[PDB]
Amino acid sequence: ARTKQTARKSTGG
Amino acid sequence: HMLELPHEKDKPVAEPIPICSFCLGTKEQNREKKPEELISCADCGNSGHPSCLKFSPELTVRVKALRWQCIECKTCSSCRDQGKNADNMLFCDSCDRGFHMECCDPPLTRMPKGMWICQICRPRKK
Ligand SMILES: [Zn+2]
Ligand SMILES: [Zn+2]
Ligand SMILES: [Zn+2]
Ligand SMILES: [Zn+2]
């Protein structure tokens, strides 16, 4: 699953 | 089609910014210097190539049909707040809407191992 936090990390910040 | 929530249907849509916030390319140039239409945030107008957003083609089609918020603008579709903790807001793997774990029904306290999808995207039972 994804969260706002993981999405930031995945996409670069 | 993708269902819209009543509060999404009549909200203002921000002017879209025609360059990707990740790589600064227009629709003509993603990171591979290939054309790719942008997805744009309805609250602030910030855009991203689906490839820079790390969306699959299947999620991309669905998000393009909805009033989408970027990662920073995403608010919980249940309570309408951001709250202070980003590892607490799940993003749906079907429609990319945000929901606080505490706002799920029933509430979650632990991350799902695999995909997570919101109640809007779960089909009606027989
Ligand atoms: Zn890009
Ligand atoms: Zn935004
Ligand atoms: Zn909430
Ligand atoms: Zn959903």
Author numbering:
A (entry chain B): 1 to 13
B (entry chain A): 190 to 315
What does the paper say about this structure?
The developmental regulator monocytic leukaemia zinc finger protein (MOZ) also known as (MYST3/KAT6A) is a MYST (Moz, Ybf, Sas, TIP60) family acetyltransferase that is required for self-renewal and differentiation of haematopoietic stem cells. In addition to the MOZ acetyltransferase domain (referred to as the MYST domain), the N-terminus of MOZ contains two tandem PHD fingers comprising the double PHD finger (DPF) domain. The structure of MOZ DPF shows the typical globular domain of a DPF with PHD1 and PHD2 each harbouring two zinc atoms coordinated by C4-H-C3 motifs in cross-brace topology. The structures combined with biochemical studies reveal how MOZ DPF manipulates the structure of the H3 tail to sample its modification status and promote its acetylation.
The DPF–H3 complex structure was solved by SAD using the anomalous signal from the zinc atoms and served as a search model in the structure determination of the DPF in isolation and in complex with H3K9ac and H3K14ac by molecular replacement. Unexpectedly, the H3 tail adopts extensive α-helical conformation in complex with MOZ DPF in contrast to the extended conformation of H3 peptides observed in other complexes. This helix encompasses residues H3K4-T11 and spans across the DPF domain. The side chain of H3A1 inserts into a hydrophobic pocket formed by residues M300, P301 and W305 while the N-terminal amine forms a hydrogen bond with the main chain carbonyl of G303. H3R2 engages in a network of hydrogen bonding and electrostatic interactions with two aspartate residues, D282 and D285, the main chain carbonyl of C281 and the main chain amine of F280. Interestingly, H3K4 engages in direct hydrogen bonding interactions with the main chain carbonyls of I260, E261 and K263, an atypical binding mode for H3K4 in comparison with other PHD complexes that was also not observed using the shorter construct. H3R8 also protrudes towards the H3K4 pocket, with the guanidinium group forming salt bridge interactions with E261. H3G12 and H3G13 break the alpha helical conformation. No interpretable density is visible beyond H3G13, indicating that H3 residues 14–21 are flexible and do not interact with the DPF domain. In the unmodified H3-DPF complex, the region C-terminal to H3G13, including H3K14, is not in contact with the DPF and is therefore also potentially available for acetylation by the MOZ MYST domain.
